Design a protein around this ligand. Structure first.
Ligand code: NMY
Ligand code: NMY
Ligand code: MG
Lengths: 252, 252
């Protein structure tokens, strides 16, 4: 019957019950336990699931328990300090959506400031890593989407266009977030927060209005909006120095 | 302003240049080279990218080169035989979308039947792996989506509902593909092929109609369609035995 309505108090009880269970089972291998996500920001809605992180001392520790009771869902990730710190300092194309975890840490157990160290690492990532992630995003994702919607324009199918438009709008949101080196609060607010930022590529806000309103049935307006956004990207990358190497047929 | 229009003959010319370049650089470390994706089953549209794969003899080989010339995009993955076969034999929630690669391999170099060996491995995966992936999908993705759209109904934002509905429809497509052990052709045909399968959970095809048509502006009809799909999931999982024990507050 799906998730039920729960209050913040009930969630913190579950959190502290899980904390006790983790300490009973693993004992001194537990370096730190925190809550992240919406419950960590104390923004959590009545239906939100629970996300917790655990720093282990045992080397190469990397596992997780993800379950539901039928009424609520919990995910607990267990990582060694080294594994967690490397993850916090790696910038992938979906960094603005995944690494909000490290800017929403609610500590409930920490034997040696480990969670603070993870937070510091996540916020001190070198600027060059965001630059590379932006160039990789344009090649590995945006360029590929451009071929996908241009294929639709000539040979269809248009039934993929609304889903692909959503993907392009989400990828554009990642590109902006990588530029500003900021993580989005929640998944539901990614597009709302993306259009309120500075230095938007031309055509991005117009494209997002289709995705946020759900008016994705006019394929011609979508294709025309995607091309304008695709065009706006390339002046935007030159204006900010995110220059993509296009000089070789084969780069190895 | 790429990607540009290309013919199959122009793509195979680029492919064989890369094959020549791969053999020049890595020589006898190359066990096999193949083309997958749309060019692999030679359906490729006028704008499709080029996807290639390489089997290496080097033990820990796992790297990729992904680039564009401004006109076309190429991705070449280099994997040891052990790494590639283990990947082909592991079933994640996005198996129906990622592992079609292994059912579309066009060999252009193969020193010892390595590519046929990859195809055999990918198609002989134990039924238990698909069963576990289905149960994990329902918990890790579907249950989480249900909480998210129920939050939207109570506290918004409505601007996330069209994007979240697309995500739910794609997760349902994964659920169907894992059930029937089938991989989807391309990203563009995932939804069309998913709704043509048997044993659909009640409410999925109706939900896909909103996503495929792009009529995602009636949040009220979307939430009702999402709930109906969510109900159909619980009957569908019971009828096929994709049952997870949910009786414990903490299952470890
Ligand atoms: N190649 C065999 C195995 O691949 C894995 O990585 C897989 C996955 O993470 C990785 O995903 C990569 C991303 O990361 C990278 N940032 C952009 C790139 N386009 C994407 O590639 C994949 O996603 C694309 C669609 N978006 C597809 O067009 C493409 O065919 C597909 N290879 O591609 C691999 C799938 O083939 C592991 N690296 C390793 O277990 C072994 O190498
Ligand atoms: N935990 C720290 C690091 O996590 C990484 O994996 C990351 C990522 O793949 C992984 O993704 C996992 C999946 O895989 C798994 N099959 C289902 C699970 N819902 C999902 O979890 C993630 O996606 C959810 C939304 N769908 C989010 O609600 C959730 O907060 C998020 N942790 O979450 C991790 C981020 O926390 C690496 N394993 C490793 O570098 C290190 O352990
Ligand atoms: Mg989660």
């Amino acid at each position: 019957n799906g998730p039920i309505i729960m209050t913040r108090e009930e969630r913190m009880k579950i959190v502290h019950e899980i904390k006790e269970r983790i300490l009973d089972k693993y004992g001194d291998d537990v370096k730190a336990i925190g809550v992240y996500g919406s419950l960590g920001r104390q923004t959590d809605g009545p239906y939100s699931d629970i996300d917790m992180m655990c720093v282990m001392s045992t080397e190469e520790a990397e596992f997780s328990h993800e379950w539901t009771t039928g009424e609520w869902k919990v995910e607990v990730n267990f990582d060694s300090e080294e594994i967690l710190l490397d993850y916090a300092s790696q910038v992938e194309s979906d960094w603005p959506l995944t690494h909000g975890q490290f800017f929403s840490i609610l500590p409930i157990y920490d034997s040696g400031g480990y969670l603070e160290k993870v937070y510091q690492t996540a916020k001190s990532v070198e600027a060059q890593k965001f630059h590379d992630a932006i160039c990789a995003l344009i090649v590995e994702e945006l360029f590929e989407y451009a071929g996908k919607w241009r294929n639709i324009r000539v040979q269809g199918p248009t039934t993929f266009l609304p889903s692909l438009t959503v993907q392009v709008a989400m990828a554009g949101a990642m590109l902006i977030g990588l530029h500003h080196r900021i993580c989005y609060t929640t998944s539901a607010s990614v597009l709302t927060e993306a259009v309120k930022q500075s230095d938007l590529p031309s055509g991005y806000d117009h494209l997002c209005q289709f995705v946020m309103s759900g008016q994705l049935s006019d394929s011609e307006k979508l294709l025309e909006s995607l091309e304008n956004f695709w065009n706006g990207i390339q002046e935007w990358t030159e204006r900010h120095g995110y220059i993509v190497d296009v000089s070789k047929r084969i780069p190895f």
